[PDB]
């Protein structure tokens, strides 16, 4: 039969432009927002509304049609929905670049530790290739330890030039487990966790120069979007829940992490809305950051992996993106 | 959640220190701001929604409950010309009981502005003098012991 | 209806149609709920 | 490439027309040239003045009721089918045109080029029928604080001076 | 148009490679097969790829092939003018 | 009381209601039995999923965290500390610690399975109401087996 | 009502961009805000308690004098002089005509501030306004 | 408003039409799915001026269609609807909801929200029609309509408008 | 570059440098399902209306 006519002009992908999504994108984009962390109404007979299997999301059944679009399962692609996180979490996939990114700039005011003013850093920036310069720019930064408020001129090291700075030392970031965690040297050293707010807080301090510098773009990709704050649903065509004899269902194993997700971010919610002392936020805050981190990667070294029932570790999307029998 | 509550909204301040105790007060530059944005955005919202309600009402479906405004129920009315029909119910469309609550919304700002006049009046002299911003130290210099023998050391 | 809109755009007359394997679109789900916006475009930017 | 996605409301008000419906258009040659507005009347002419074109391209290769019936007769014969739509353009213009003769726009578009209004407010001068200058700056909103009222109450005068039959 | 040379300075090769037939030879063909009209007489024949052969062979296909440079440039060659030596 | 969202196949051309419809499970088509006019084409049969039943557990999707190829100790003891310090699944851990009892109990006496299922299903229907609180667990698990 | 707006007290303090406008039909102070929503889509009533004089947007403009009584007289002033127009030189340098014609003017301008004889008085200025 | 605007249509012939003829086929297509069509982008196409110097770029194969595809630019006359304008009509219909004014090749719905409170609806006169002291509103009436609001999409356009300011309505 | 090896890896890093991508060669087009501009598509097939209208 093949799909229906459409309006539409019939065109040919000509780029493909990569970026990230920013929290506002992602909230416009959705079209429901997932409350309930179940899948079946009390009866068992249709999907609950705001649950993971929501009606809104599209339809993988052959007898129905999409809340959306009114459309079947041969013509609907599938509508994104989005959950609202409790704290924002760390991206498993760019923890590393968040690192790098942290000690390139000053965790106090958000400029660069090291300006034009230094004839090294001239050259760097002066770099055509974002990836070398960015590499370039982290060597020279990550030995500074001091803000710099001021710097000599460069006419002369004579008299000292005042630069927008603070003054504030800079600590020695590590990442131990999911956390980040910065040591200060007095004038042994003092440590705590950087919490992921105050990162986020930071990255949204930095110029629109600032970070272009770092190889970021100011409308595809910033730093700020790098901390995942509203966390995108994919609709059930991607996590499709098959059945064995069709009178018994199983559902995907992203479903499976997705409730987990739903529950460790109510818990949370409930947790700090009355009491929760903070020691148990932070608990709380891991489990939730573990749980998002594996639902991307569920290969992550040094950490768990988050199991099923039957014991077969969860598959998650870097998994299905990767091998021979992956996706590409 | 009495303390939970409070430390959201900015109005109390917690500060922790090594002596890991938990200590409490009041920031008073803070709490300023909190009370002088939130009343703001309150009667914000208040007069935000009564010029949304003084538009046109809408439409909705009895049966899916979709929300239909003025627009998207004149592109689909049958070819008869004589009723709404809901797209993915192909029913008639009942209208919306939003006409009334036009005079109830401004009954309630009128009465809020009345109630909040006090916090008004003084934020119109805390703008006028001099705010000094509190800290834990400061704070002490106003300390009053709150138990003979108190297990916490009131000490910087 | 022949009704096409893009929520968040908020635009109705700006819409393409285009035929990519499945698989593809199945990629580009999977990248858009891991924070990654695989963007298709019709028109070039940059000459070769 | 920049997905902005920032676009001002259309409004006849602010004489925002769009982006597609900007003052300077530019042309199939490639030459920046000036938006034109068309009023009831001026379409009613350019319109028909094509229709009668393309009748004799294909032969080569009065009150309102005669000529209603006319243009009905010739826009069946000169026009393919699916014409449903031009149908009621040309019954609609044809009932409430201003102008008749080609003589009568041309002195009209004459007299309201001298103002220096913007296309859309010319056309929008031409097309509505105004008694006095309180009508056009109520039912016209952007003609306020464009133009005294001296000035438009003797163009609306002299626009219904020349008012036809 | 500053992408398209102009016939008198065209610096690409005048034989019709492998690949420009064997679409030219397919394009044509699903054409005819389309009840496209043919402009070759034909003496008995109904296989539109031999059709199209035919039509090749005596130079009654108006198409004409746009070849593209690696900048962006093409050119633009009749299927008449191009000659048929492989 | 909600939208239909429903889908049923019916021939335009033979316009008969109800249809013969046969599904061509190895050619992928369903058909119109009467014309022969394919009706929908590219249909799916009825690992990466998991099949649970929900009769005894209802809906309830959780998953463990145990070690894999490369784990800390630390991670392990304190993620699981953070499950276990969950206020939802505790009313529902009551009920899954009954059968996982009622379970060992069926085991230790050498019954089939359907048993326990039969009477993991039966302390799950007579759970949660008013009459079955002042009477001893023993005494539940036991009436259920 | 020192900086709040009647109807919506939308406070100065608060709402500093706040701008005041009065209409010549009842010279009701009104905050912009209030305007546009009332009045957008249509003529309606004044909002005020006892008012039931209806107004136009298009009519609004910005308070000149801080007393809304001297308002009121200046702006019947500049419609009385827009057709009671005359100079010395009208009457031939005759100052007791003038000054007499002056003297007249003056006393329908204070009619019609106070309303002495409206219907009168109102029919006389459209009488003359044609000649 | 009535507007003269340089479009761009991508005309697509079937193999059928590659005769010595095609041409003229295009130009045929063109009159057969241009004028009359709706576009939310440039509103009502009505007519094409110059119907003899319409400019055909050279046609593109497509892969596996087999069709040719055509740039067409070309010069037309199109009616594009917008918020605030005020426009005369004629009444077609009349319902309780609101009577639908005919302006050219739109219809513009007045809702009763956006009609003067004097204005009522009798269904008892045959046909129904707004009765009011000043004025009576029916089918073939000539009515005097401000666009209030418009939504355009991308083969369809409707637009709603209102008759409470003043010197609108009944003529 | 993701088709080969690291294919998560290198997706991660092109979405933090906004990366672009021209689909000029025959991975993006296999990928995109389109005819890939090698061989037989390294040229477009166009009609002739000059040669056309002499033909007939
Ligand atoms: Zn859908
Ligand atoms: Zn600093
Ligand atoms: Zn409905
Ligand atoms: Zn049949
Ligand atoms: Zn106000
Ligand atoms: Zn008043």
């Given at each position: ?19 990230l999504?920013?929290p506002?994108?992602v ?7 997932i409350?309930?962390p ?19 999301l ?11 679009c009114?459309?079947?399962?041969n013509?609907c ?20 670049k ?5 000690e390139?700039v000053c965790?106090h ?11 090294l850093?001239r050259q ?16 020279l930064?990550?030995?500074?330890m ?6 000599p ?6 008299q ?11 600590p ?16 042994e ?8 707010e105050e990162?986020l ?13 770092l190889?970021?773009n ?7 979007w790098?901390?995942l704050?509203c ?6 065509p991607?996590?499709?829940?098959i059945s ?8 995907d ?18 947790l700090?809305?009355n ?5 148990a ?7 939730l ?8 990667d ?6 768990p992996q ?16 990767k ?6 | 959640?009495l303390?939970?509550?409070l ?19 009041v920031?008073?530059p ?15 919202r ?7 309600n ?16 003025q627009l ?15 797209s ?31 916090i008004?009046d003084?934020?119109?002299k ?7 911003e ?7 210099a106003?300390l ?6 108190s297990?916490a050391?009131?000490?910087? | ?6 929520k ?17 679109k ?7 709920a891991?924070?990654?916006?695989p963007?298709?475009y019709?028109?070039?930017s940059?000459?070769? | ?10 409004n ?6 769009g ?9 199939h040659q ?10 009831l ?6 319109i ?26 010739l ?17 609609y213009?044809?009932?409430f ?13 004459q ?16 097309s ?11 039912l016209i909103?952007?003609?306020?604080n464009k133009?005294?009222?001296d ?6 005068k ?8 | 148009?500053?992408?398209a ?11 019709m490679?492998?690949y420009e037939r ?5 394009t044509?063909?699903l054409?005819?097969?389309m009840?496209?009209?043919?402009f ?10 031999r059709?199209a ?15 593209y ?18 | 009381?909600?939208?239909?969202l ?5 021939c335009?051309?033979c316009?008969v ?20 006019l ?10 990466v ?23 800390d100790?630390?991670?392990t003891?304190?993620?699981?500390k ?10 529902d ?7 996982a009892?009622?379970?060992m109990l ?7 399975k359907?048993?326990k299922?039969?009477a993991?299903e ?5 759970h ?12 539940i698990?036991?009436?259920?087996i | 009502?020192?900086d ?5 007290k ?8 706040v ?7 009842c010279?009701?102070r ?10 957008s889509?249509?003529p309606a009533?004044?909002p005020?308690?006892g ?5 136009r947007?298009?009519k609004?403009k910005?308070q000149?004098?801080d ?12 419609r009385v002089?827009?057709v ?21 003017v003056?006393?329908i301008?204070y009619?019609?501030?106070?309303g ?6 109102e ?9 | 408003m009535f ?18 003829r095609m ?6 297509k063109?009159?057969e799915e ?13 007519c ?7 400019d055909?770029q ?18 037309a006359?199109?009616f594009?609807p ?20 005919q302006?050219?090749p ?20 045959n ?10 509103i ?8 401000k666009?209030?609001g418009?939504?355009?999409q991308?083969?369809s ?5 209102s008759?409470k300011?003043?010197?609108l309505?009944?003529? | ?5 690291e294919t998560v ?8 440098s ?8 025959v991975?993006?087009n ?14 477009d ?5 000059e ?6």
């Amino acid at each position: 039969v093949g799909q229906q006519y459409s309006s539409a002009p019939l065109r040919t992908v000509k780029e493909v432009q990569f970026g990230l999504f920013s929290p506002e994108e992602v909230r416009a984009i959705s079209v429901a927002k997932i409350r309930f962390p179940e899948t079946m109404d009390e009866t068992q007979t249709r999907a609950k509304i705001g649950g993971l299997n929501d009606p809104r999301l599209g339809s993988i059944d052959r007898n129905l049609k999409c809340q959306t679009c009114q459309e079947g399962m041969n013509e609907c692609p599938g509508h994104f929905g989005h959950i609202d996180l409790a704290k924002p979490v760390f991206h498993v996939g760019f923890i590393a670049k968040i690192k790098k990114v942290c000690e390139c700039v000053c965790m106090h005011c958000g400029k660069l530790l090291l300006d034009e003013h230094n004839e090294l850093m001239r050259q760097a920036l002066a770099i055509k290739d974002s990836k070398k310069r960015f590499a370039a720019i982290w060597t020279l930064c990550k030995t500074k330890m001091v803000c710099e408020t001021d710097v000599p001129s460069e006419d002369d090291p004579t008299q000292l030039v005042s630069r927008g700075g603070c003054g504030n030392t800079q600590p020695t970031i590590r990442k131990d487990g999911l956390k980040l965690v910065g040591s200060w040297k007095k004038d042994e050293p003092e440590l705590r966790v950087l919490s992921t707010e105050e990162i986020l807080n930071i990255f949204k301090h930095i110029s629109v120069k600032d970070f272009t510098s770092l190889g970021f773009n100011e409308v595809f990709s910033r730093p700020e979007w790098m901390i995942l704050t509203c966390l995108p649903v994919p609709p059930p065509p991607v996590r499709p829940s098959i059945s064995f004899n069709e009178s018994q269902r199983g559902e995907d194993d992203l479903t499976f992490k997705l409730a987990d997700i739903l529950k460790a971010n109510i818990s949370l919610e409930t947790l700090e809305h009355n009491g929760a002392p903070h020691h148990a936020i932070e608990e709380a805050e891991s489990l939730l950051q573990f749980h998002v981190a594996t639902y991307m990667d569920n290969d992550i070294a040094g950490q768990p992996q988050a199991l099923q029932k039957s014991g077969r570790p969860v598959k998650s999307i870097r998994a299905r993106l990767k091998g021979k029998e992956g996706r590409i | 959640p009495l303390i939970a509550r409070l430390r959201s909204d900015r109005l109390i301040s917690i500060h922790k220190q090594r002596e890991e105790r938990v200590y409490y007060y009041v920031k008073y530059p803070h709490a300023i701001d909190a009370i002088k944005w939130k009343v703001h955005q309150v009667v914000q919202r208040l007069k935000d929604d009564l010029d949304k309600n003084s538009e046109p009402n809408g439409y909705m479906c009895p049966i899916c409950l979709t929300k239909y405004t003025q627009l998207e129920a004149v592109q689909l009315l049958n070819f008869d010309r004589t009723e709404f029909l809901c797209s993915l119910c192909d029913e008639p469309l009942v209208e919306d009981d939003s006409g009334k609550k036009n005079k109830e919304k401004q009954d309630k700002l009128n009465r809020l502005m009345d109630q909040i006049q006090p916090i008004i009046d003084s934020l119109k002299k805390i703008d006028d003098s001099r705010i000094e911003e509190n800290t834990f130290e400061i704070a002490l210099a106003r300390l009053i012991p709150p138990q003979n023998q108190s297990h916490a050391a009131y000490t910087y | 209806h022949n009704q096409f809109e893009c929520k968040g755009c908020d635009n109705k007359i700006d819409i393409y149609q285009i035929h990519i394997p499945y698989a593809a679109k199945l990629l580009f789900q999977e990248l858009m709920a891991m924070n990654i916006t695989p963007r298709l475009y019709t028109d070039r930017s940059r000459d070769f | 490439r920049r997905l902005k996605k920032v676009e001002e409301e259309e409004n006849a008000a602010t004489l925002q027309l769009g982006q597609e419906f900007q003052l300077k258009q530019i042309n199939h040659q490639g030459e920046e040239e000036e938006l034109i507005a068309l009023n009831l009347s001026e379409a009613r002419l350019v319109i028909k003045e094509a229709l009668v074109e393309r009748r004799r391209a294909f032969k080569r290769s009065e009150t309102r009721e005669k000529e209603l019936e006319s243009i009905d007769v010739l826009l069946e014969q000169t026009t393919g089918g699916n014409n449903k739509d031009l149908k009621n353009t040309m019954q609609y213009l044809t009932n409430f045109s201003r102008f008749r003769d080609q003589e009568t726009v041309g002195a009209v578009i004459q007299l309201l080029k001298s103002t220096g209004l913007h296309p859309f407010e010319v056309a929008q001068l031409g097309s509505l029928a105004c008694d006095t200058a309180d009508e056009a700056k109520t039912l016209i909103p952007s003609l306020n604080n464009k133009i005294s009222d001296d000035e438009l109450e003797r163009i609306l005068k002299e626009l219904s001076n020349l008012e036809t039959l | 148009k500053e992408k398209a040379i102009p016939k008198d300075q065209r610096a690409t090769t005048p034989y019709m490679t492998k690949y420009e037939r064997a679409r030219i030879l397919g394009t044509r063909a699903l054409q005819i097969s389309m009840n496209a009209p043919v402009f070759v007489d034909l003496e008995g024949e109904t296989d539109p790829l031999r059709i199209a052969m035919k039509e090749l062979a005596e130079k009654k296909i108006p198409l004409v092939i746009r070849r593209y440079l690696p900048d962006g440039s093409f050119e633009d060659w009749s299927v008449e003018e191009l000659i048929v030596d492989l | 009381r909600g939208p239909n969202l429903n889908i049923v196949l019916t021939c335009p051309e033979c316009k008969v209601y109800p249809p013969k419809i046969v599904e061509r499970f190895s050619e992928g088509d369903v058909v119109c039995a009467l014309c022969g006019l394919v009706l929908s084409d590219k249909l799916v049969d009825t690992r990466v999923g998991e099949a649970s039943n929900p009769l005894l557990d209802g809906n309830n999707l959780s998953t463990r965290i145990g070690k894999g190829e490369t784990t800390d100790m630390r991670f392990t003891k304190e993620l699981n500390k953070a499950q276990g310090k969950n206020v939802m699944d505790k009313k529902d851990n009551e009920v899954q610690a009954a059968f996982a009892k009622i379970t060992m109990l069926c085991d230790a006496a050498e019954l089939p399975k359907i048993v326990k299922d039969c009477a993991k299903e039966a302390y799950k229907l007579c759970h949660d109401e008013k009459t079955l609180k002042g009477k001893s667990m023993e005494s539940i698990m036991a009436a259920s087996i | 009502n020192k900086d709040m707006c009647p109807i919506c007290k939308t406070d100065r303090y608060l709402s500093p961009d706040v701008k005041f406008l009065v209409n010549p039909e009842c010279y009701h102070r009104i905050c912009e805000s209030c305007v546009d929503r009332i009045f957008s889509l249509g003529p309606a009533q004044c909002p005020y308690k006892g008012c039931d004089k209806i107004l136009r947007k298009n009519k609004f403009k910005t308070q000149i004098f801080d007393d809304v009584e001297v308002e009121k007289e200046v702006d019947i002033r500049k419609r009385v002089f827009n057709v009671f127009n005359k100079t010395i030189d009208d009457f031939n340098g005759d100052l007791v005509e003038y000054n007499k014609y002056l003297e007249e003017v003056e006393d329908i301008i204070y009619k019609l501030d106070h309303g002495i004889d409206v219907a009168k008085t109102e029919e006389k200025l459209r009488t003359y306004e044609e000649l | 408003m009535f507007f003269i605007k340089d479009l761009s249509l991508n005309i697509t012939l079937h193999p059928s039409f590659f005769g010595p003829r095609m041409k003229q086929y295009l130009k045929t297509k063109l009159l057969e799915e241009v004028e009359g069509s709706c576009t939310g982008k440039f509103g009502y196409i009505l007519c094409v001026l110059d119907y003899d110097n319409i400019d055909i770029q050279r046609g593109r194969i497509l892969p596996t269609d087999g069709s040719a595809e055509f740039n067409v630019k070309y010069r037309a006359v199109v009616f594009k609807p917008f918020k605030g304008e005020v426009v005369d009509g004629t009444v077609v219909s009349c319902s309780q909801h609101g009577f639908e004014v005919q302006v050219g090749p739109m219809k513009v719905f007045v809702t009763k929200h956006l009609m003067p409170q004097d204005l009522t609806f009798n269904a008892g006169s045959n046909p129904p029609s707004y009765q009011s002291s000043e004025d009576v509103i029916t089918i073939k009436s000539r009515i005097r309509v401000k666009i209030e609001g418009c939504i355009s999409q991308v083969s369809s356009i409707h637009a709603i408008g209102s008759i409470k300011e003043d010197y609108l309505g009944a003529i | 570059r993701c088709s080969f090896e690291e294919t998560v890896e290198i997706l991660f890093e092109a979405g933090a440098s906004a990366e672009l991508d021209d689909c000029r060669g025959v991975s993006e087009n296999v990928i995109l399902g389109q005819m890939a501009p090698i061989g037989t598509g390294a040229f477009d097939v166009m009609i002739d209306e000059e040669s056309l209208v002499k033909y007939m």
